[PDB]
Amino acid sequence: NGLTGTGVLTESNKKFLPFQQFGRDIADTTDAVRDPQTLEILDITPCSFGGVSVITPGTNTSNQVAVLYQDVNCTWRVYSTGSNVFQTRAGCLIGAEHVNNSYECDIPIGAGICASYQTQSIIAYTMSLGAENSVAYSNNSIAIPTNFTISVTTEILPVSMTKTSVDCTMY
Amino acid sequence: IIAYTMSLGAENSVAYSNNSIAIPTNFTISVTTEILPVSMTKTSVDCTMYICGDSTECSNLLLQYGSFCTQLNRALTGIAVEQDKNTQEVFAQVKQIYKTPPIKDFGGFNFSQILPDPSKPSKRSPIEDLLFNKVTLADAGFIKQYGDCLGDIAARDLICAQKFNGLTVLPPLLTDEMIAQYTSALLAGTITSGWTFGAGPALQIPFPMQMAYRFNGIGVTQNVLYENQKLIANQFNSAIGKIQDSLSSTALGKLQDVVNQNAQALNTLVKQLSSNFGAISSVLNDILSRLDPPEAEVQIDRLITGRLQSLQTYVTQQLIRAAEIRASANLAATKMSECVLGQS
Amino acid sequence: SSTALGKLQDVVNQNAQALNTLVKQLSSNFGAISSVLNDILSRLDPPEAEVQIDRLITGRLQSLQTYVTQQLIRAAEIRASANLAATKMSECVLGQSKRVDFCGKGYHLMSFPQSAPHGVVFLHVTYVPAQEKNFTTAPAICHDGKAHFPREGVFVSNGTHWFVTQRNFYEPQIITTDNTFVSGNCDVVIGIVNN
Amino acid sequence: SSTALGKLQDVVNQNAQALNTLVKQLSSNFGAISSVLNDILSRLDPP
Amino acid sequence: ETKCTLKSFTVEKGIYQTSNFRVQPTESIVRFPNITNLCPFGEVFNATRFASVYAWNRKRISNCVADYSVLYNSASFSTFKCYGVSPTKLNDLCFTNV
Numbered sequence: 001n002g003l004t005g006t007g008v009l010t011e012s013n014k015k016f017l018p019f020q021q022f023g024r025d026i027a028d029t030t031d032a033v034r035d036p037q038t039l040e041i042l043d044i045t046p047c048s049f050g051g052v053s054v055i056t057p058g059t060n061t062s063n064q065v066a067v068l069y070q071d072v073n074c075t076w077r078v079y080s081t082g083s084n085v086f087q088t089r090a091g092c093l094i095g096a097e098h099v100n101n102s103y104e105c106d107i108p109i110g111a112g113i114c115a116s117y118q119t120q121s122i123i124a125y126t127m128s129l130g131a132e133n134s135v136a137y138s139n140n141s142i143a144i145p146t147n148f149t150i151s152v153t154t155e156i157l158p159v160s161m162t163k164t165s166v167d168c169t170m171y
Numbered sequence: 172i173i174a175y176t177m178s179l180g181a182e183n184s185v186a187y188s189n190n191s192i193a194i195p196t197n198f199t200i201s202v203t204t205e206i207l208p209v210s211m212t213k214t215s216v217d218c219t220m221y222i223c224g225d226s227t228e229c230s231n232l233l234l235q236y237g238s239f240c241t242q243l244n245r246a247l248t249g250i251a252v253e254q255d256k257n258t259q260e261v262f263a264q265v266k267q268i269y270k271t272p273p274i275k276d277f278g279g280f281n282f283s284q285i286l287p288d289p290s291k292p293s294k295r296s297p298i299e300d301l302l303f304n305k306v307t308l309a310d311a312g313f314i315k316q317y318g319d320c321l322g323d324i325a326a327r328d329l330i331c332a333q334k335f336n337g338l339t340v341l342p343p344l345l346t347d348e349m350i351a352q353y354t355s356a357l358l359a360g361t362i363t364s365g366w367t368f369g370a371g372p373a374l375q376i377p378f379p380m381q382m383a384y385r386f387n388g389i390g391v392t393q394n395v396l397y398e399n400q401k402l403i404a405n406q407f408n409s410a411i412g413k414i415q416d417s418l419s420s421t422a423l424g425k426l427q428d429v430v431n432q433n434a435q436a437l438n439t440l441v442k443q444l445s446s447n448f449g450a451i452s453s454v455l456n457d458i459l460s461r462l463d464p465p466e467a468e469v470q471i472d473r474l475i476t477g478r479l480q481s482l483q484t485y486v487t488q489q490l491i492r493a494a495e496i497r498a499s500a501n502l503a504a505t506k507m508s509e510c511v512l513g514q515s
Numbered sequence: 516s517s518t519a520l521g522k523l524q525d526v527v528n529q530n531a532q533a534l535n536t537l538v539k540q541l542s543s544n545f546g547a548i549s550s551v552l553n554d555i556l557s558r559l560d561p562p563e564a565e566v567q568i569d570r571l572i573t574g575r576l577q578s579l580q581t582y583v584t585q586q587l588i589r590a591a592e593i594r595a596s597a598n599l600a601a602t603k604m605s606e607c608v609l610g611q612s613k614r615v616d617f618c619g620k621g622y623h624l625m626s627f628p629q630s631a632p633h634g635v636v637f638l639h640v641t642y643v644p645a646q647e648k649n650f651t652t653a654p655a656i657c658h659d660g661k662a663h664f665p666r667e668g669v670f671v672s673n674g675t676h677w678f679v680t681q682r683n684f685y686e687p688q689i690i691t692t693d694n695t696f697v698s699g700n701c702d703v704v705i706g707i708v709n710n
Numbered sequence: 711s712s713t714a715l716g717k718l719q720d721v722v723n724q725n726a727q728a729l730n731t732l733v734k735q736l737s738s739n740f741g742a743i744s745s746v747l748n749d750i751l752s753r754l755d756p757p
Numbered sequence: 758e759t760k761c762t763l764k765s766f767t768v769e770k771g772i773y774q775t776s777n778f779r780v781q782p783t784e785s786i787v788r789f790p791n792i793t794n795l796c797p798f799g800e801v802f803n804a805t806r807f808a809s810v811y812a813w814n815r816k817r818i819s820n821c822v823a824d825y826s827v828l829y830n831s832a833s834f835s836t837f838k839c840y841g842v843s844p845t846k847l848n849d850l851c852f853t854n855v
């Protein structure tokens with residue numbers, strides 16, 4: 001009826017009064033419409049949806065990349081499918097091979113998963129928290145040191161930043 | 172409704188004289204809780220999708236304001252990586268995952284309500300489970316598929332309303348199970364090694380003797396502990412029971428306010444898409460249809476300016492809130508190193 | 516000398532990037548016909564060039580405002596960092612700290628300051644125990660129906676004999692009446708041993 | 711009693727100056743023909 | 758996309774956010790009501806006797822098709838100004854109370 005737009009049209013359950021033609025949501029966008037020939041109500045849903053991130057090892061080393069689709073669950077709305085599809089609680093990762101080891105985080109993907117440029121290709125793994133250890137606790141056992149080490153460590157702290165001034169008229 | 176003058180507290184008087192002293196004859200072992208926020212939600216914004224939508228005319232008009240969106244996203248990513256850094260300073264103090272032995276002989280002290288429960292899917296403690304159910308988040312997971320809200324489910328579910336306008340929430344780097352593992356390692360180290368695992372290698376010591384060391388640290392001789400060991404263990408166990416009780420009963424307001432504030436900010440962003448900002452309408456499709464390019468550009472310019480300043484206000488207030496959360500996380504890290512890894 | 520001071524370089528980088536972003540934002544039309552005042556003032560006459568100049572003025576003013584706001588926020592963070600550095604200077608360099616992990620990892624012995632571009636570096640000298648050894652231990656010693664507790668140490672046993680040592684360094688000594696003190700009898704302490 | 715609390719007076723001064731700056735900023739045209747609503751609403755018709 | 762949003766030809770190791778996943782429209786559809794007649798262009802603009810201005814006439818325009826090109830060879834105008842709408846979008850809209 002003259003109102004233009006873009007989106008996906010689906011059958012609706014809303015039911016208009018006879019003096020109504022369009023339906024609006026809280027952001028005041030038209031989200032429902034009555035078809036002027038069949039008199040049926042339709043819902044209008046937008047077309048773009050879902051975040052995308054790109055994981056690179058740096059283009060000074062390679063132009064291989066992996067892509068994380070943060071709203072896809074494959075078990076699609078993807079640009080490519082290639083190989084090495086790996087599902088994560090942060091989304092579907094495409095272009096990186098899943099391994100069973102665990103290292104320190106290199107590139108944080110999220111939800112406990114990191115990625116790195118190892119063997120060349122891109123691998124994705126679960127980050128390790130640290131080495132496992134156990135204390136030999138008993139009710140009558142103690143451990144006493146017999147030597148020592150003198151350690152020297154550095155700690156860096158910022159104290160100032162640059163002082164600037166601006167001339168409004170000149171800018 | 173009544174109105175009164177508030178009271179400062181009960182009145183008290185000390186029986187001061189020049190040769191009188193008061194000495195305690197018994198003691199109590201008290202256990203208290205302290206809650207501290209450490210992170211907030213990490214968000215990201217797509218300018219083009221928020222300001223224009225799928226409008227190509229608007230998106231071409233917006234190319235005179237690309238520096239402003241790169242700036243907004245730079246600020247938001249700074250906040251987002253700062254949150255993970257916060258969590259790491261608080262919880263990742265030690266990099267050895269200590270386990271507690273099956274020797275649960277700690278001199279009579281019962282640590283069963285704060286030690287991991289292997290009967291859960293996670294390895295959370297009874298106390299940690301009680302805490303986990305008193306804070307209601309807004310995102311049960313972070314995978315909401317397109318097909319899952321397709322129809323009128325959008326604009327009735329607030330998260331799909333946010334997502335259709337370019338507002339994304341990213342998941343934290345450390346899962347909740349990893350944080351539970353970290354706190355479990357801290358507890359195991361502190362009950363089997365005292366304060367030595369925070370200064371170098373963990374050196375075991377019987378619990379009773381560690382408690383005697385800690386009694387020495389406050390000016391009480393060790394025989395006071397060794398001669399009252401059962402009473403002290405019973406008082407500790409009763410105080411821990413009181414905690415669980417109180418909790419499971421009835422709050423974590425300081426941790427719920429963070430979630431509430433972030434959700435309210437995002438929803439305010441979404442409703443501010445209904446403002447004309449001085450244009451003839453707030454819909455780009457009512458302007459682009461019924462108006463031709465050169466004289467629709469004025470209206471689209473008004474809308475673009477308004478929505479840009481909306482995004483700017485959001486980012487500024489997020490930066491201010493992130494500074495406050497950063498201060499809180501620094502305090503929590505200091506408390507972790509000085510109260511948990513030592514005696515203050 | 517080998518290979519960094521990333522936290523001190525990020526400050527310089529951030530300030531430089533902010534100024535350069537200000538400079539490039541002078542290429543925005545903000546909804547005007549051009550971003551150059553000389554293309555507007557030539558080809559347009561005062562009353563109808565004023566609308567374009569007003570658009571440019573509003574845009575550039577808000578650019579300056581954004582810069583100043585973000586500078587204020589960053590200055591608050593640097594202020595917090597400088598307050599922490601002053602506290603560390605008074606408590607780790609001008610004294611010896613008992614606060615755990617405040618002046619390095621280990622037991623703090625001393626600290627030395629060094630100046631760096633826009634910041635400070637602390638060299639923390641700490642004491643780290645090493646080469647530990649296992650011993651049997653006991654809370655008290657029973658001699659004559661009396662319980663003896665160590666004065667400033669702990670009771671250890673090399674397997675057959677009992678000594679009293681200091682907690683942080685193995686230096687065994689013979690248990691005497693100058694190492695210990697008496698309190699009560701031998702019926703209340705749990706793991707008391709005879710010696 | 712002789713002669714200060716500068717750090718406590720600066721807070722009062724800053725808050726007062728902020729409010730007064732708000733009040734004087736009501737004299738800006740912001741690109742309009744005048745800064746008074748009554749000079750615009752009289753001599754000009756609604757649209 | 759990242760090279761271009763960075764305004765640089767080199768990208769450093771890491772992970773970067775890009776634009777949301779876009780889908781392009783495949784078709785174009787138009788849905789107007791079922792209207793067959795043409796609007797009374799010849800009994801409004803071609804009337805025989807008009808009214809005086811103090812008692813001005815008001816005719817109601819109901820369900821009809823607005824084809825104003827049929828006037829191109831019958832009458833010139835010399836004043837024609839629209840107010841809420843541009844003249845290039847007249848034959849692309851539906852009008853409510855005419």
Ligand SMILES: *[C@@H]1O[C@H](CO)[C@@H](O[C@@H]2O[C@H](CO)[C@@H](O)[C@H](O)[C@H]2NC(C)=O)[C@H](O)[C@H]1NC(C)=O
Nearest residue numbers: 072073074075087088089090091312313314315
């Ligand atoms: C991807 O989809 C799967 C299933 O459609 C989600 O997980 C199911 O989860 C339940 C537990 O809640 C299991 O009992 C089922 O066996 C799972 N089935 C499958 C096929 O996985 C999963 O959560 C989705 N992706 C993510 C990471 O959320």
Ligand SMILES: *[C@@H]1O[C@H](CO)[C@@H](O[C@@H]2O[C@H](CO)[C@@H](O)[C@H](O)[C@H]2NC(C)=O)[C@H](O)[C@H]1NC(C)=O
Nearest residue numbers: 134135136137138141143272646647648649650
């Ligand atoms: C202290 O004595 C304990 C008891 O034997 C030693 O610890 C065990 O070491 C073995 C081999 O490394 C492990 O498999 C066990 O899990 C350990 N714990 C037990 C048995 O509870 C420990 O090496 C001794 N410490 C020193 C410094 O000599």
Ligand SMILES: *[C@@H]1O[C@H](CO)[C@@H](O[C@@H]2O[C@H](CO)[C@@H](O)[C@H](O)[C@H]2NC(C)=O)[C@H](O)[C@H]1NC(C)=O
Nearest residue numbers: 145146147148149150151643644645646647685
């Ligand atoms: C305590 O540790 C030091 C090392 O820090 C030991 O001294 C080293 O001894 C070895 C073998 O005799 C030498 O090769 C090194 O040169 C020594 N180091 C230094 C810095 O001189 C010392 O022997 C240990 N003491 C005990 C009692 O074990």
Ligand SMILES: *[C@@H]1O[C@H](CO)[C@@H](O[C@@H]2O[C@H](CO)[C@@H](O)[C@H](O)[C@H]2NC(C)=O)[C@H](O)[C@H]1NC(C)=O
Nearest residue numbers: 183184185186187188190191192193194195196
């Ligand atoms: C310590 O001795 C003082 C002196 O009698 C006691 O304090 C007084 O108590 C009475 C009754 O409670 C009050 O009316 C007085 O005001 C108190 N102060 C005085 C007289 O100076 C006190 O109860 C004693 N404390 C203990 C623990 O026994």
Ligand SMILES: *[C@@H]1O[C@H](CO)[C@@H](O[C@@H]2O[C@H](CO)[C@@H](O)[C@H](O)[C@H]2NC(C)=O)[C@H](O)[C@H]1NC(C)=O
Nearest residue numbers: 196197198199200401402403404405406407409
């Ligand atoms: C010190 O206080 C404790 C209470 O905290 C006293 O122990 C209580 O004694 C009463 C009466 O004998 C019992 O009903 C309670 O069950 C005891 N409490 C616990 C936790 O066991 C203790 O007697 C006091 N000591 C002195 C010397 O007064």
Ligand SMILES: *[C@@H]1O[C@H](CO)[C@@H](O[C@@H]2O[C@H](CO)[C@@H](O)[C@H](O)[C@H]2NC(C)=O)[C@H](O)[C@H]1NC(C)=O
Nearest residue numbers: 275276279280281282283284297408411412415
């Ligand atoms: C430590 O305290 C807990 C209480 O929280 C004790 O566990 C209970 O044990 C009894 C006996 O098996 C069970 O019937 C209960 O269901 C347990 N859970 C409760 C009461 O919540 C535990 O036994 C104590 N540990 C020791 C060594 O006594």
Ligand SMILES: *[C@@H]1O[C@H](CO)[C@@H](O[C@@H]2O[C@H](CO)[C@@H](O)[C@H](O)[C@H]2NC(C)=O)[C@H](O)[C@H]1NC(C)=O
Nearest residue numbers: 651671672673674675676677678687688689690
């Ligand atoms: C525990 O230490 C004592 C040291 O007092 C050892 O006993 C002495 O050992 C030396 C050398 O073997 C002998 O000359 C002495 O006669 C021993 N007795 C005394 C009273 O000095 C004892 O061997 C050590 N035990 C273990 C298991 O190492």
Ligand SMILES: *[C@@H]1O[C@H](CO)[C@@H](O[C@@H]2O[C@H](CO)[C@@H](O)[C@H](O)[C@H]2NC(C)=O)[C@H](O)[C@H]1NC(C)=O
Nearest residue numbers: 656657658659660661701702706707708709710
């Ligand atoms: C430590 O020494 C005392 C005294 O030498 C031992 O005491 C005996 O205790 C039992 C049970 O109370 C009595 O029936 C005996 O009459 C006591 N004998 C004496 C001589 O006092 C005590 O058993 C010793 N402890 C150990 C573990 O050997």
Ligand SMILES: *[C@@H]1O[C@H](CO)[C@@H](O[C@@H]2O[C@H](CO)[C@@H](O)[C@H](O)[C@H]2NC(C)=O)[C@H](O)[C@H]1NC(C)=O
Nearest residue numbers: 035036037038039040788789790791792793820
């Ligand atoms: C608009 O015209 C269409 C045809 O051009 C009509 O569609 C008919 O609808 C009836 C339902 O009662 C069907 O039985 C016919 O098969 C339809 N025709 C076609 C060609 O599909 C429609 O009814 C008209 N609008 C109204 C309000 O009557």
Ligand SMILES: *[C@@H]1O[C@H](CO)[C@@H](O)[C@H](O)[C@H]1NC(C)=O
Nearest residue numbers: 058059060061767768769770
């Ligand atoms: C990346 O390229 C530049 C220029 O080609 C070079 O100076 C730099 O060293 C390279 N990076 C590394 C890590 O070598």
Ligand SMILES: *[C@@H]1O[C@H](CO)[C@@H](O)[C@H](O)[C@H]1NC(C)=O
Nearest residue numbers: 097098099100101102125126
């Ligand atoms: C990796 O871990 C999986 C977990 O089931 C296991 O099946 C597999 O054998 C391991 N090795 C691989 C597949 O690289």
Ligand SMILES: *[C@@H]1O[C@H](CO)[C@@H](O)[C@H](O)[C@H]1NC(C)=O
Nearest residue numbers: 138139140276278705706707
């Ligand atoms: C220590 O535990 C053992 C069990 O191996 C027990 O026989 C002994 O009485 C306990 N001693 C103390 C002091 O707890």
Ligand SMILES: *[C@@H]1O[C@H](CO)[C@@H](O)[C@H](O)[C@H]1NC(C)=O
Nearest residue numbers: 799801802803804805831832
């Ligand atoms: C009206 O239409 C007739 C033809 O039917 C034409 O002759 C006459 O000039 C027209 N008059 C006006 C005012 O349009």
